């Protein structure tokens, strides 16, 4: 949402698919780290993704 | 819109080089024809000017479109919006050239104006006015424009009318007589 | 008459506008006549901004006292030209103009058409110029002669003591300037002022002074023996003229590109460092760098780690001055760099005053550029003494230029009086009237000197109007006893250039002004 | 509301009288300014400066008006000045008096057009007569040219500097002739630059066989004095320049940034050795100069001057014969600055200047005016403009006319004879024109201050004698003087254009009969 | 600051010649049209109210012209003729004006 | 009526002044206006003053220079003497009071002679010669050439004079604290720079509790923990504490998938590595004025690192000098040699104000700070101004030497000596020199008026007891005894250089103002 | 600009005329104005005139004296 | 306030903060109020008295 500002260039359509998948994999990775931490309550100064 | 993107810096210099060499070769193609006079409504850059000086040709910029069209009609030159051919390569032909005996810029009222004398293809006529103020000069050019108009009418219609109001002089009485014919109001 | 042409326009007519001009000139000369003469009283001007002047040089007054009368502005312009040539006599010029016009009115009011007096002025100027040429005293470049000339110029402006102090500085400067054929008064003369400690203590510094200081703490304050590097090529960062924003993919490459970007300036500074270390293998010697452009803070760190003094953003003539001071080779491309291109100074240190910073260059072996470091207790006095300094400098420059010199205190003027009055109407007769008037007007300088100095005018003028014998000397007016004085003996002089230029300028101005009839004003709304 | 809602109108004899009044006033405000005895006029400009000059054209040019015919006359004056330089000291006066006598026939209910035809015949006869009474003169003979110039200038402030003025004008004009038109070469008066520098005296002003540049050496090292310099004119800038086509760069490898930085340096170098390959000495440009290129040129011991006005560039090129160049790689030894007798940079006082003198055969030149103050200098340069203008008119026509009103009186009695042989209604206008001509010598007389009526009568009666047409009016004596020994001569074309524009003014004004205001467009 | 001296008072209106005369003729015609309808066995009358609010109808043209206070000079002559004929012979004052 | 004439219309609306009338009356009157303005100023019995600026800011003050700075004045020579005193303050410290009083007295007595018809130029000559003679005779008055470099007692006794002058209540505390400041600062960057002392204002806890720290202070927050180590290792960074962003517009780019994961991860890892390397050299506290990356402070918390924030360039310069460690524009190299060293650093609460303290012990020399405590911030302004003036006094003392006996005694001796030289002068300038000598009675006069005792016989007794060479005896401060006191025993001294410079500047101001005769004034 | 000089402020606001300029031009012009004013007046072929006074009273006239009496001249 | 926001207070220092004093001398008293408020608490009232 407000992370580093970057333009991206992708020839293969499948690579574009992979790009969007990889973004969501970023957020999923963060969430997995959060869960596997074993905690249950999370607070954030910054906004939380729905 | 063509953005120029560099991933190999080794070529920026040559890029800039042809950025002018394109105009250079266009000019050289024009001059190799042997044309010594060029006119252009479009802009003329110093790049072209110095090349022309080294060639010693004649160059004029920002000329009004109607004037250059008249030039083509007189000298027999061809208006050229660009350089091209039935084939893609940009070339130029001497057949496009127009002719006139002598071309001079001359100083009238410490302002240099450009003259073209005796185009062989089609005789042209231009008139210079001399006067005291701009008021008298532009009113007399209006007068002359009317003169040319009426003479054009005379030539176009081989028919003339006696001036000084003879027209209505006759018309009044002729219509007076014809009036009684109607009998109405 | 032109009113019918234009209603909002304004005109005078011949008598009317002539009276306007003479009245305006008379008022202007009345305002200014308090100035000339060492006994004169300088003037303080206050701008609408609240600033302050304390000058006596009339050019400042005319340019800075706003007037509306047209001829006043005209005279101000001619005086400005004069000041741009020689420096004083602007006062003398305006006084000459006013009083000459006064006599002219005295005569034309008697019905004499002005053109006659014009011609008389022409002939009188010719004869006066001949006499001025023949009378000029050819003197060589003796130091004491220049000293006296400077003192005579300066005592017009300041305390006697202040002028006495400053005279030695100015003469030593000028002596230390000439390459025996051409002084230029610009590069070798650095005029700087510090709000510091005195007006008297202002003195020549044998080297050059800079108006800024070091930008880092580790910058050493003092350097025993200095090697000077004069340059202007940027040691600050810069980005090429062509859009070159770049991209990267790994955060490590981000650091790598940062290093690369710095690397070019790194090379630049490293060349200088290597030059130093090659030359300053010895510990004692010091390396100083002057850049006309800026210096990057990282570059500051680099130079500091080698203990190298560097200064940024000096005025573009300062490198000229350094060249003429320490003989360093002002360069641009550090790529072609040699020890031979260095400059050498006997001493360089920093002086901190107030919040600003100053830099000293000292003990040039054969300095050809110097600095009149102006010490001033007060901001206005700085400006006043600076104008005085410039006056004295230009006067000495004219003195050295012209192998002659004119005795001061107006002895030239009484000489013109006696010579011109000693012209039978060899002129066409009616012009003798104008010649008489011109000679009369010439006598103003002694008149105003006496008046400002308090002595009674007519009797002093008559007394000095005594050419003595076959040795009828050039006699000046005493400025404290009101008695005849041999200017040459007492050593009160002035530049021939001054007198010749003022005579010519005043003649032209007067002959033009006396030839106007109406002053019209018709301009766009 | 019908017509325009706040547009005035006025009609007929009222309009004619009003225009005549306006013309008469226009003439009157200048009648004192003519003659060697002339007055000296100074102006208050709208925006602060002071302008003082005898020349009528500038005087009128600093006049705004409300009545239109006055504006017409203003433009007439400016045209005559542009074409010939002087005569404007007289043209508007002649036109005004022409009109003043002209109006006297309006209350004769004499319709304007016939009077106009009379005027046209009058102009034809005047031109013929003046051509009959000319004198051809050699153009090479210098002192006669100097005499002509002195004659044409002994009306303004420069009179007392006549010798210097004439030498200056002759030198400047003579050496400006672009012989590339075969035997039809033309001189031009926009390469004869005039520079006003205060200080000094008129006597110090002189013709410099070259150009003046109010610039300075960019770097200390370049020598300020050179005997036989070589000069290169770079119209293009000498530095790295924007890629005109909005180019961009995307570097990825570390070395690339420093490499592109080096590339512009290398381009600068390329230009530098391209210049030095021709062994020049002097570098001039209208654009800026990179300090790095400045470095390289210094290393080559080459003097460089930056950012000079384009006209100044052209004049320098015409001075040292070289031609301007915009491409260093295309530099040719044919444009090497050969023909500079000396390159120098002096100090006028608080300012550097550039001197390029002693050209082999300089065709361009600027005049160095050094006087008292900028306004007097401006008056001087205006007078110089007039002098050099009439000099060029002579070099176009070697025919001369005796002025001092003498030609006017010749025309007067010639038209009188034509009139008394030319019976008709138009006769009275014709002789009216003849009489109107007589006022130039009249004005000379009043500006002298002598008995106008008796002097004029003696003049006219003298000039009924066929044996002499050279009798004119001396400026100062106020006595009848034959012009030959007095020597006040003028170029024919001057007085030609004078009368010619005068009668044009007459016709244009006399045809006017109504006024309409408020066009709002 | 001198100024030109005027001939008559500021704003002294003047209008000379054929335009002046034709203007007068037109004004007389305008006056006529105010009365043109009036006369006739099937003729006409007018109503004019003053500034005071008092109504006044009239068929005799002279009365009407008296009510129409004319400012333009030439028409004042016509209205005076109306008074003259009214004092002399009667209706046709209308006709007189026409 | 209603229409006199002007022979000169040269001015478009402006003031022309001429005829000596302005010099004889108006200029003198303006100077006397200033003299009355701050006559109450100087004096131990002088009482303080308050003024609000054009922008409605309070200024409780006793110093003359500060108060003159807050009156936006228009008469020119008023500005003359004002800025003269201003520069004098820029040179020595107190004396602004002195020089303004001198100017007033000299001007007032000079106009009297001008009225009695003495030549203005001759007045100039007399004043100049008198000032030079006074300069000549002054050194012969020095007593108690206090020489002790770094003792506390001598310097405390000395600085008591200025502190007592501009604050009469609290001599002991301020004396001891400023002396502690002076001794704590050695010659490190050259001879006890005034700038080496910093002042902080902290409201509450009235003046008696104000204290001095041998370190330097900050009124800013903290980001992680709050700890002090007896071996505190400080790192300084002008660069913002973050990954070095390229100045060029550098947009990170990717081409395939794993770039996102690896790029974010690597950013994290290399910030971690950088801060670890910083920690590896043992630095436990870091300072910067640049922006702080949240990642960086997070890792610092992980590694127990202290952070200091938002410092201005001058502030970090101060800290650099305090710990003697070189600020590093490059974030990487926590080099051992240029790395901080402080006795103790922590965060404390004073006056509901977060305070960062660098509590220190430095033999080599440190730039210490004084802590000001009390209720009214305006009193803080006054008291800190006085303290800084005292610091300037101590600096001038260190410049060369040679205390002189204050309390007017010196000036009475000046008056007597100058007068005595006056009757041996003879010439019309004798009146000039006599009046100049008379002028010095203004100081004891001012002390009397602010003291409220009958000045005249005080001056008379002072003269009488000064007829026996008692150069050390001066004006007392006591209502019970409105007579006399012996200054030397009372320790009421002051500096040679200050008096000398004040005298010379007052002379210069006078000679300048008297000299100008007619004035010209464009409309503001 | 905007500020020429007066060597005589003698007048509190008034017209000073001098230099024969008024006699040579302005006075003559005024007389000619009158001449044109009643040139049409005299003559058997002279045609009549009307004028209204300052008080709006008609005056049809051919006589010159009467018409001059009704023009309030300055 | 002029903005219409009400504010009641018993602590005198708060009140004095709200009473924006123009007269100079009283500004000192209000500053004492701030000082005591930052130092020890109620009696800021008492301090002013």
Swiss-Prot record, chain A:
Coiled-coil regions listed: none
N6-acetyllysine: residues carrying this PTM: 3
Subcellular location: Cytoplasm
Superkingdom assignment: Eukaryota
Function: Component of the chaperonin-containing T-complex (TRiC), a molecular chaperone complex that assists the folding of actin, tubulin and other proteins upon ATP hydrolysis. The TRiC complex mediates the folding of WRAP53/TCAB1, thereby regulating telomere maintenance.
Disease: De novo genetic variants in nearly every subunit of the TRiC complex, including CCT7, have been found in individuals with a broad spectrum of brain malformations, and clinical phenotypes ranging from mild to severe epilepsy, developmental delay, intellectual disability, ataxia, and other features of cerebral malfunction.
UniProt similarity note: Belongs to the TCP-1 chaperonin family.
Subunit structure comment from the entry: Component of the chaperonin-containing T-complex (TRiC), a hexadecamer composed of two identical back-to-back stacked rings enclosing a protein folding chamber. Each ring is made up of eight different subunits: TCP1/CCT1, CCT2, CCT3, CCT4, CCT5, CCT6A/CCT6, CCT7, CCT8. Interacts with PACRG. Interacts with DLEC1.
Protein name: T-complex protein 1 subunit eta
Gene name of the record: CCT7
Residues of the full protein shown: 248 to 297 of 543
Swiss-Prot record, chain C:
Function recorded in the entry: Component of the chaperonin-containing T-complex (TRiC), a molecular chaperone complex that assists the folding of actin, tubulin and other proteins upon ATP hydrolysis. The TRiC complex mediates the folding of WRAP53/TCAB1, thereby regulating telomere maintenance.
Chain residues that bind ADP: 37, 89-92, 156-157, 409, 494
Organism lineage string: Eukaryota, Metazoa, Chordata, Craniata, Vertebrata
Residue sites binding Mg(2+) per the record: 88
Keyword set includes Nucleotide-binding: yes
The protein's Enzyme Commission number: 3.6.1.-
Gene: CCT6A
Assembly notes: Component of the chaperonin-containing T-complex (TRiC), a hexadecamer composed of two identical back-to-back stacked rings enclosing a protein folding chamber. Each ring is made up of eight different subunits: TCP1/CCT1, CCT2, CCT3, CCT4, CCT5, CCT6A/CCT6, CCT7, CCT8. Interacts with PACRG.
Pathological condition linked to this protein in its record: De novo genetic variants in nearly every subunit of the TRiC complex, including CCT6A, have been found in individuals with a broad spectrum of brain malformations, and clinical phenotypes ranging from mild to severe epilepsy, developmental delay, intellectual disability, ataxia, and other features of cerebral malfunction.
Binding site for ATP: 37, 89-91, 409-410, 494, 499
Identification of the protein by name: T-complex protein 1 subunit zeta
Reaction catalysed by this enzyme: ATP + H2O = ADP + phosphate + H(+)
PANTHER family given in the database record: CHAPERONIN (PTHR11353)
Subcellular location: Cytoplasm
Keyword vocabulary terms for this entry: Acetylation, ATP-binding, Chaperone, Cytoplasm, Hydrolase, Isopeptide bond, Nucleotide-binding, Phosphoprotein, Ubl conjugation
Predominant location: cytoplasm
UniProtKB/Swiss-Prot annotation, chain D:
Database matches in PROSITE patterns: TCP1_1 (PS00750), TCP1_2 (PS00751), TCP1_3 (PS00995)
Binding site for Mg(2+): 86
Record's protein name: T-complex protein 1 subunit gamma
Keywords, ordered alphabetically: Acetylation, ATP-binding, Chaperone, Cytoplasm, Disease variant, Disulfide bond, Hydrolase, Intellectual disability, Isopeptide bond, Nucleotide-binding, Phosphoprotein, Ubl conjugation
InterPro entries noted in UniProt: Chap_CCT_gamma, Chaperone_TCP-1, Chaperonin_TCP-1_CS, Cpn60/GroEL/TCP-1, GroEL-like_apical_dom_sf, GROEL-like_equatorial_sf, TCP-1-like_intermed_sf, TCP-1_chaperonin
Modified residues (Phosphotyrosine): 240
Cross-link (Glycyl lysine isopeptide (Lys-Gly) (interchain with G-Cter in SUMO2)): 8, 241-242, 374
UniProtKB/Swiss-Prot annotation, chain F:
Post-translational modification Phosphoserine, affected residues: 18, 157, 208, 264, 312
Top-level division of the source organism's lineage: Eukaryota
Family indicated by similarity: Belongs to the TCP-1 chaperonin family.
Gene3D superfamilies assigned to the protein according to its UniProt record, in alphabetical order: GroEL, GroEL-like equatorial domain, TCP-1-like chaperonin intermediate domain
Listed PANTHER family: CHAPERONIN
Purpose: Component of the chaperonin-containing T-complex (TRiC), a molecular chaperone complex that assists the folding of actin, tubulin and other proteins upon ATP hydrolysis. The TRiC complex mediates the folding of WRAP53/TCAB1, thereby regulating telomere maintenance. As part of the TRiC complex may play a role in the assembly of BBSome, a complex involved in ciliogenesis regulating transports vesicles to the cilia.
Positions with a binding annotation for Mg(2+): 94
Biological processes per GO annotation: binding of sperm to zona pellucida; chaperone mediated protein folding independent of cofactor; chaperone-mediated protein folding; positive regulation of protein localization to Cajal body; positive regulation of telomerase RNA localization to Cajal body; positive regulation of telomere maintenance via telomerase; protein folding; protein stabilization
Record's protein name: T-complex protein 1 subunit theta
GO terms under cellular component: azurophil granule lumen; cell body; centrosome; chaperonin-containing T-complex; cilium; cytoplasm; cytosol; extracellular exosome
PTM sites of type Phosphotyrosine: 25, 500
PROSITE patterns referenced in this protein's UniProt entry, alphabetically: TCP1_1, TCP1_2, TCP1_3
Cross-link (Glycyl lysine isopeptide (Lys-Gly) (interchain with G-Cter in SUMO1)) at residue(s): 454
Binding-site list for ATP: 95-97, 165-166, 407, 494, 499
The protein's Enzyme Commission number: 3.6.1.-
Organism field: Homo sapiens
The reaction(s) this protein catalyses: ATP + H2O = ADP + phosphate + H(+)
Annotated positions of the N6-acetyllysine modification: 313, 395, 461
A UniProt-annotated Pfam family: Cpn60_TCP1
Enzyme class (EC, first level): hydrolase
